[PDB]
Amino acid sequence: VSELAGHQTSAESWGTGRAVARIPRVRGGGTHRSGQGAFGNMCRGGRMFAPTKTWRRWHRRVNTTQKRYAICSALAASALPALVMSKGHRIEEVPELPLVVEDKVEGYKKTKEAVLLLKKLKAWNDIKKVYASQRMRAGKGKMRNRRRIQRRGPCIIYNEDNGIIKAFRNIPGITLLNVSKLNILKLAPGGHVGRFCIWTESAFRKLDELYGTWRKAASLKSNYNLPMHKMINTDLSRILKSPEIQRALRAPRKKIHRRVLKK
Amino acid sequence: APSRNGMVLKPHFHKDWQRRVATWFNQPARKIRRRKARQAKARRIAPRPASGPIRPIVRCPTVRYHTKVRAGRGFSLEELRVAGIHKKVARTIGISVDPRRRNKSTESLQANVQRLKEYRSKLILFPRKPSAPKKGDSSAEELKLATQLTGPVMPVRN
Amino acid sequence: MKFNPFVTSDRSKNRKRHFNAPSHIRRKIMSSPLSKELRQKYNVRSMPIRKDDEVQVVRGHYKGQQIGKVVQVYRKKYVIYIERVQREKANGTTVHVGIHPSKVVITRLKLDKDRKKILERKAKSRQVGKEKGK
RNA sequence: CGACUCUUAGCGGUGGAUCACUCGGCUCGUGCGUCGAUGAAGAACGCAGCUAGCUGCGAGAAUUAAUGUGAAUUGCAGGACACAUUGAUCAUCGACACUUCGAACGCACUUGCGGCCCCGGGUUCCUCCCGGGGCUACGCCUGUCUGAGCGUCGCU
RNA sequence: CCCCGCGGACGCUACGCCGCGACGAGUAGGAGGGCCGCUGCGGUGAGCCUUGAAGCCUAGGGCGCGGGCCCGGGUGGAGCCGCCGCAGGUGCAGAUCUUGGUGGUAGUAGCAAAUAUUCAAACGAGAACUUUGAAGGCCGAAGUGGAGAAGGGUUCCAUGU
RNA sequence: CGACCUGGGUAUAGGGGCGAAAGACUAAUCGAACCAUCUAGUAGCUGGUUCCCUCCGAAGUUUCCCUCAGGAUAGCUGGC
RNA sequence: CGGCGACGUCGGCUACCCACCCGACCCGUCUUGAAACACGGACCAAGGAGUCUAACACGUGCGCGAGUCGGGGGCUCGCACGAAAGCCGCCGUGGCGCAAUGAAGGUGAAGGCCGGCGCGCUCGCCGGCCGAGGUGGGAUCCCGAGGCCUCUCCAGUCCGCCGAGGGCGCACCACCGGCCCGUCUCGCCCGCCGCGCCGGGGAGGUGGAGCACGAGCGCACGUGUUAGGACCCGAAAGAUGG
RNA sequence: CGCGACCUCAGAUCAGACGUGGCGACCCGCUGAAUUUAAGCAUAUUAGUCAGCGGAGGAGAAGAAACUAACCAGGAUUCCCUCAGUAACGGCGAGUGAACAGGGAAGAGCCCAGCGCCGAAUCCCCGCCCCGCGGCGGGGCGCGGGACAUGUGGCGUACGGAAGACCCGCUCCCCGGCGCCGCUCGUGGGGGGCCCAAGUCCUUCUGAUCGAGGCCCAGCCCGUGGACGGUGUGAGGCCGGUAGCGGCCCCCGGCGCGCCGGGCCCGGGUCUUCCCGGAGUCGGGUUGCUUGGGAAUGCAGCCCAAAGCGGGUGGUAAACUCCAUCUAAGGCUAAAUACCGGCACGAGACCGAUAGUCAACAAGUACCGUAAGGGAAAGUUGAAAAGAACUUUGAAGAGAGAGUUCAAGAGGGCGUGAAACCGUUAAGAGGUAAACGGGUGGGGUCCGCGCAGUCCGCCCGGAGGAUUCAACCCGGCGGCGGG
Ligand SMILES: [Mg+2]
Ligand SMILES: [Mg+2]
Ligand SMILES: [Mg+2]
Ligand SMILES: [Mg+2]
Ligand SMILES: [Mg+2]
Ligand SMILES: [Mg+2]
Ligand SMILES: [Mg+2]
Ligand SMILES: [Mg+2]
Ligand SMILES: [Mg+2]
Ligand SMILES: [Mg+2]
Ligand SMILES: [Mg+2]
Ligand SMILES: [Mg+2]
Ligand SMILES: [Mg+2]
Ligand SMILES: [Mg+2]
Ligand SMILES: [Mg+2]
Ligand SMILES: [Mg+2]
Ligand SMILES: [Mg+2]
Ligand SMILES: [Mg+2]
Ligand SMILES: [Mg+2]
Ligand SMILES: [Mg+2]
Ligand SMILES: [Mg+2]
Ligand SMILES: [Mg+2]
Ligand SMILES: [Mg+2]
Ligand SMILES: [Mg+2]
Ligand SMILES: [Mg+2]
Ligand SMILES: [Mg+2]
Ligand SMILES: [Mg+2]
Ligand SMILES: [Mg+2]
Ligand SMILES: [Mg+2]
Ligand SMILES: [Mg+2]
Ligand SMILES: [Mg+2]
Ligand SMILES: [Mg+2]
Ligand SMILES: [Mg+2]
Ligand SMILES: [Mg+2]
Ligand SMILES: [Mg+2]
Ligand SMILES: [Mg+2]
Ligand SMILES: [Mg+2]
Ligand SMILES: [Mg+2]
Ligand SMILES: [Mg+2]
Ligand SMILES: [Mg+2]
Ligand SMILES: [Mg+2]
Ligand SMILES: [Mg+2]
Ligand SMILES: [Mg+2]
Ligand SMILES: [Mg+2]
Ligand SMILES: [Mg+2]
Ligand SMILES: [Mg+2]
Ligand SMILES: [Mg+2]
Ligand SMILES: [Mg+2]
Ligand SMILES: [Mg+2]
Ligand SMILES: [Mg+2]
Ligand SMILES: [Mg+2]
Ligand SMILES: [Mg+2]
Ligand SMILES: [Mg+2]
Ligand SMILES: [Mg+2]
Ligand SMILES: [Mg+2]
Ligand SMILES: [Mg+2]
Ligand SMILES: [Mg+2]
Ligand SMILES: [Mg+2]
Ligand SMILES: [Mg+2]
Ligand SMILES: [Mg+2]
Ligand SMILES: [Mg+2]
């Protein structure tokens, strides 16, 4: 807020022997404003309580290792059909979830052939969902230039831009993303992993250089290896039903002993 | 009033600091402006190094850093003298000069003068008149082999 | 979408510019699509409206194939008045109904020196664009 | 039986809350970063066919010219305008013009009063009046002219 | 070694479900949960809506211990919300609180300083207050008279409402 | 009929003016005017301090303080 | 098991009015004590008060870990989003931590067992090993006599469970020692290019926010304290210029 | 006993210029508090801050060491990170508090006086002629005047310089014009102007549609354009715009080339001989302010007042002694940097009319005070005025009909229209002021598809229907197991 708000007034308190509250009142006379309250958060025209100020520390710095960790987790999550379908990305007739196409799509120039590519990859229902979800935002965002809202479509990832950005970018929901400059704000849209992604082949090959394997370290980063698991075998049901566990247990106590009436 | 254990603190906020607060919201815009000016200057001086003139090899002053070597302000007058360069021509050919620096050790003196000879051997000199070259350099040497250099000229390595 | 950093997309700014637009660009704002036959005869799609050309209303209460000549281009109200597109008021007399020019199609153009030149420039630019596209 | 009063509902008043709308702000960022004696900022007074304010403008007065655009402006009237023997409107604005105070400048102002130099009229060119035009502030630089000094001298 | 029968209920959002025992006051104060509520952002609902959004009204039906919520009816005419996270100028009975509006008081106090009015008529829809005339009275020349200064700035003067 | 009343023109300005003297007067303000700012001055003092349920749950006592309407400290409390 | 069921009745009360019985003083606030002859409150609508920043402390969540952190700069079509995001690594400068102690000059954290020698003189030269000592508890883990089985035994075969006792002992606790720095008391040796007003070393008390095989760094959230207008409103006053 | 020269002064409406005042967010030079904190208060702190005065520019100030250091040395200034809440200061209390080094951003250096040398080589003004006008320039001429030896210009400045010899290298500058480019370079450089894709396709809702369905062919059409706004709802295709190393026109600017014209003048190395510096200034004493600077960091007043192998600094006052460092008392200089005022723009997890600027509106307006100054309230008919014709009572206000509109139960302070309060109608009640909790009862308004009350799995029987079951054959697909 303006630091001058509520204070461009020479108001001073009336005192205490005049049967009115001790809030400062504007001096002068001959107008509605004279004698009215001022300088208070409770007074009409006075400044707010604790005027918000520009030095509020809007920005947060996140550890680089944590940021790369989040990127790795989002990349892993996009490869699970349960998670991507949980985001509602209409991946039903997609031939294979880590969808990779040849580099010929990097040379696309026209939205016509981009759309035809999507249709042959059976991803067009995602764009159809975006189209059916376009609507008007609820609330003051309409006044604040965020008038229209929509859903997120699939994310196209490219290695070299040879006009593919221009070929796309008129498809609602499509986010074009360079493989060496990946963004968590686009991979996990609202803080929830599992966004549908379409990879160019060169971008798919570059992933072992960008983030490395576990046998090797990442080469295109100065020092980064993939994070280690704290639990290799996560199949809890299979583990519990393994014979090694089953031999060490005691028998289940599956008889319910309720309260017995005292006759 | 203090309450239980805790550091005795002396905040320096008794002096109306609110009127003088430096906010850094124009930091990325400042970075972009600096980058654009860098690109414009490098574009202006096409074959010359973008970073600037060659700086000398210099040892750090105090006992904390004297094991380390950084770049200096300019080559000394004695270094120029024994390198055979006129002190009014070195700056035009792109050598920083620091007249107010005197040498105290022949080891550092030799390091700097060998650096100067190496730079002179690495230099490509366009003729003043493009049609008529007097003593500058060869046509095959400068027709394509002269290109802009990024980063420091012959960087200082510990 | 829009990429020019010097072109605003603010709703309030755009509305301010629209309602405070000077007359010479209010004319450009009050532009109407040509009929199919005119869009074929001339390689142009729309055309700013004029005093004495004949249109037909395509939306609202007065739709119809009737060809009515404009009699007024009320630029302050952003409307035009058409010959038989009128309405009778209570006292007996009649007035015209304001109609936004975007809700009509021009069927005949009031040709003079200037309109032909405007058509020429628009058709030339369209040819340039399509020949670049091919 | 009513009157009065209380409670609840329907409706009608008073009131302008709520909700929606927003040519307004606030905050940040960018690019320039430009007043004035060749008369600034500010003020005053005036200017529209019908106009008090707001806006615009300066006696050429809600504007002249020029250039771009190309049929209006509009609340009513009136009136041009073959739109090419050249053009309504709007915009741009480089030509022209820009009343009185105001650093404010002949003197002074809560009033008014001069002086010099040309031109025109009564005069019938000589000097009185009337009108028009141009000067008439302070400090300061360089030069010019006029000078002052029992200042220091030289000739006589 | 099952089988004339090929069959055999529910479950376990494991942050879930189920069982048993004991206990329940509470200011100042502390903590937990909130599928309590408000506003805006990132996702999400192939969400809702001009065959009717928000809002408001209701002797309509209900749910929850409660915060509150859902639905019906009416008005209204253009936007609104659920779920997962995010961020707050986020919850009012008080503050002789601020702003705005409204009551009782109350058709009450009051329209009581300087003697005073009355008759007829005119206009006019309308006369105790206008106008004309006739009476009766006051200021009584240090005036309730005639003019000015300062101040006011058109109040001056006709005509019309 | 006078140390008389009074208009107008001037002069004196705030810790100053002016006072036949009452701390009177200085634009309804005077034991120090008014205006704007420093200023959201400070307050151990007065008043207020906004949704629900669940659980736990006090102290007005020690010691020190220009300390006695307040603090620190121990004690009492809750949470992890 | 019975009765009753459509223009008349059946059931419904949160919700509307009325009646009756019992109970029932007006809320907020200061207070030992408020219904108070204590103060604020005529009514209604809207606004209205622990906020942000900085610095600590502790708890918790996350990443990496004797390291950690790019926050400033730079590099990447400059800019819809992007003022974002990504990268640097001979940009780790630097900050914090990995060392403490004394005013300072300065100094600066390894012991234990087994041997031959001097005098195993409360000790100097080594060797061999091991590598922070010892006591008492100490979750957990390990060994374990002895048992628990079938239609039965004369004879061992595979594994399960219970188990008196025994052992290794995590973290942590209490103590005893040991090492580092300061400072006292005592006493004797050693070194040598500078034989010195030189330097080094030991024993016994005692001071230290120490060592004794690291736990930190960064980010986030919560609570508490303080600086700031600082939960909101409030002086009598002071100063500057008019 | 006049006339000249010089000096020092004066006048002029003399010829030609310049200053003034404004803005003041940022900057520079001064002057300068108190509130406040210290739980009091006087040093301290607030604070060299507010207020006051002066002076600028697009940046200003600073700035090329009388420096930092003590190193194996660095090297103008300014800004960022860090040093560092540290050294230090402080009723050593509250509190205050830098600098060096290191890493970055940017990087650029220089000119006088003096010492000298060069026949004052120097400069201004006035005339005449020519080429240019664009910020008045050049060329030539003047026994034209003036400034100036009390010192103009050239060389030359601490980084040494100059003058002679010996040797070596001729190596090529600037300014203003003519024409032409690549034209300028993240894709013209800038400014201005005019243009550039595709549904108003079929059926339907509506007052209006921008809504809802549909458009076979891989899918109505464009998409380098699905930002935004307007249009009678909610529009990629109706319109303006949007994208585009899209088009065209005009104007403006620096870059190279060939020509022309003008100015323009020798550089380096070695040896010899010379020559070298800023004074009421430094420094000291004292005083007062200031600083982190503490036996005194800086500034200033006053008194004293220098030196030349000197002077200053070397963070504890002094003497002696060595070493290190720089060269004060003259001046210029871009970039990195700042910007709550101005012009023109873009954006937002901000506010949505008691909010957000005081000001969404004829707002610094109305109005108040003599004045300095104080300073409001105040948005919304409707898509379209289609703004209620006409009849009728009243004098009119105002009614009653009628009419417009989807709506006047939108009718000119006209979106919706809450509460408090009031009028009317209906129901109920009333002598312990109202109101409240618990428990019922009566009435009333609504709710229940209330009004003959269920259902559904197997079995029994009746009356009927049937792309008909099982078992096999063919084919497809799964699930499990196989050394
Ligand atoms: Mg406000
Ligand atoms: Mg809402
Ligand atoms: Mg650089
Ligand atoms: Mg009502
Ligand atoms: Mg004109
Ligand atoms: Mg006078
Ligand atoms: Mg004489
Ligand atoms: Mg109990
Ligand atoms: Mg309880
Ligand atoms: Mg609030
Ligand atoms: Mg309230
Ligand atoms: Mg409220
Ligand atoms: Mg309360
Ligand atoms: Mg009465
Ligand atoms: Mg009376
Ligand atoms: Mg009488
Ligand atoms: Mg009388
Ligand atoms: Mg009179
Ligand atoms: Mg009159
Ligand atoms: Mg007295
Ligand atoms: Mg008075
Ligand atoms: Mg306060
Ligand atoms: Mg106050
Ligand atoms: Mg004491
Ligand atoms: Mg009390
Ligand atoms: Mg109590
Ligand atoms: Mg009491
Ligand atoms: Mg009470
Ligand atoms: Mg009592
Ligand atoms: Mg009392
Ligand atoms: Mg009280
Ligand atoms: Mg009261
Ligand atoms: Mg009240
Ligand atoms: Mg970034
Ligand atoms: Mg380091
Ligand atoms: Mg530190
Ligand atoms: Mg132990
Ligand atoms: Mg110990
Ligand atoms: Mg604490
Ligand atoms: Mg003159
Ligand atoms: Mg105090
Ligand atoms: Mg106090
Ligand atoms: Mg005090
Ligand atoms: Mg003080
Ligand atoms: Mg000031
Ligand atoms: Mg000035
Ligand atoms: Mg400067
Ligand atoms: Mg300077
Ligand atoms: Mg200070
Ligand atoms: Mg000279
Ligand atoms: Mg120098
Ligand atoms: Mg629209
Ligand atoms: Mg649209
Ligand atoms: Mg179009
Ligand atoms: Mg374009
Ligand atoms: Mg409102
Ligand atoms: Mg307002
Ligand atoms: Mg009336
Ligand atoms: Mg309606
Ligand atoms: Mg209304
Ligand atoms: Mg009623």
Q: What DSSP character marks residue B19?
A: G
Q: A5 vs A26, A52, A79, A92, A195, CA distance in Å?
A: 15, 11, 54, 57, 46
Query: Which residue, C86, C80, C72, C75, is CA-closest to C103?
Result: C80
Tell the residue number behind the tokens 């918000």, with chain if given: A52
Angle between helices A124-133 and A111-120 (to 10 degrees): 110
Q: What DSSP character marks residue B85?
A: -
One-letter amino acid of B44: R
Is A143 in CB contact (< 8 Å) with chain C?
yes
Residue C97 · residue C77 · CB < 8 Å: no
Per the structure block, which two tokens stand in for A206? 């570059």
Per the structure block, which two tokens stand in for C108? 């005949």
Tell the residue number behind the tokens 């969808």, with chain if given: A99
What kind and span of H or E run contains B71? strand B69-71
Whether C76 sits with its Cβ under 7 A from any strand D atom: the answer reads yes
Q: Which residues contact B122 (CB under 8 A, 6 or more apart)?
A: B154
Q: Which residues contact A27 (CB under 8 A, 6 or more apart)?
A: A10, A11, A12, A34
Query: Which residue, B69, B43, B47, is CA-closest to B58?
Result: B69
- The distance from CA A50 to its chain's CA centroid, rounded to whole angstroms, is 31
Tell the residue number behind the tokens 């709703």, with chain if given: C11
- The distance from CA C130 to its chain's CA centroid, rounded to whole angstroms, is 24
Is A55 in CB contact (< 8 Å) with chain B?
yes
- The distance from CA A148 to its chain's CA centroid, rounded to whole angstroms, is 18
Nucleotides of E under 7 A from a protein CB: 18-21, 39-49, 79-81, 84-86, 89, 95-100
List of chains touching B (3+ CB pairs within 8 A): A
Rounded CA separation A134/A28 (Å)? 56
Helices (H), B45-153: 77-83, 90-93, 106-122, 139-142
Residue A77 · residue A189 · CB < 8 Å: no
Q: How would you label A17-26 residue by residue, b for 16+ Cβ within 10 Å and e otherwise?
A: eeeeeebbbb
- State how far residue A144 is from chain C, nearest Cα, in angstroms: 8
State the maximum Cα–Cα separation within chain B, in Å, rounded to a whole number: 86
Per the structure block, which two tokens stand in for A217? 């370290």
Beta-bridge partners for C32: C47
3-state percent breakdown (helix, strand, coil) of chain A, nearest 5: 30, 10, 60
Query: In chain C, whose CA is at the least distance from the CA of A172?
Result: C1
One-letter amino acid of A50: A
The residue that minimises its CA distance to C1' of G68 is A63
Residue C21 · residue C14 · CB < 8 Å: no
Q: Which residues of B have a CB under 8 Å from any CB of A? A: 21, 23, 25
Q: How far is the CA of A100 from the centre of ligand 6 (A)?
A: 100
Q: Which nucleotide is nearest to A28 (CA to C1')?
A: H374
Query: Which residue, C109, C57, C110, is CA-closest to C79?
Result: C57
Q: How far is the CA of C75 from the C1' of D150 (A)?
A: 96
What kind and span of H or E run contains B37? helix B27-44
Per the structure block, which two tokens stand in for C19? 């309602």
Q: Which nucleotide is nearest to B158 (CA to C1')?
A: G90
Rounded CA separation B48/B37 (Å)? 16
Q: How far is the CA of B123 from the centre of ligand 58 (A)?
A: 105
Residue A27 · residue A12 · CB < 8 Å: yes
Cβ–Cβ contacts within 10 Å for residue A200, how many? 22
Q: Which residues contact C57 (CB under 8 A, 6 or more apart)?
A: C63, C64, C68, C82, C85, C99, C103, C104
Query: Which residue, C48, C43, C46, is CA-closest to C33?
Result: C46
Altogether, the residues listed in chain B come to a count of: 158
Q: How far is the CA of A8 from the centre of ligand 46 (A)?
A: 29
Is A145 in CB contact (< 8 Å) with chain C?
yes
One-letter amino acid of B120: R
Rounded CA separation A12/A27 (Å)? 7
φ, ψ (nearest 5 deg) of residue C97 = -100, 125
Rounded to a whole number of angstroms, the distance between the first and last alpha carbons of chain B is: 54
Q: What is the dihedral of CA B4, B5, B10, B14, to 10 degrees?
A: -20
Rounded CA separation A26/A37 (Å)? 7
Rounded CA separation A173/A190 (Å)? 14
Residue C75 · residue C27 · CB < 8 Å: yes
Structural method:
cryo-EM
One-letter amino acid of A170: N
Residue C57 · residue C103 · CB < 8 Å: yes
φ, ψ (nearest 5 deg) of residue B49 = -60, 140
Per the structure block, which two tokens stand in for A116? 């035809």
What kind and span of H or E run contains C28? helix C23-29
Cα dihedral A240, A246, A248, A249 sign: positive
Cβ–Cβ contacts within 10 Å for residue C91, how many? 6
Nucleotides of D under 7 A from a protein CB: 20-31, 68-75, 83-84, 87, 89-91
CB contact under 8 A, C9 and A145: yes
B69: helix, coil or strand?
Answer: strand
Rounded CA separation A214/A194 (Å)? 23
Q: How far is the CA of B62 from the C1' of G55 (A)?
A: 33
Beta-bridge partners for C94: C88
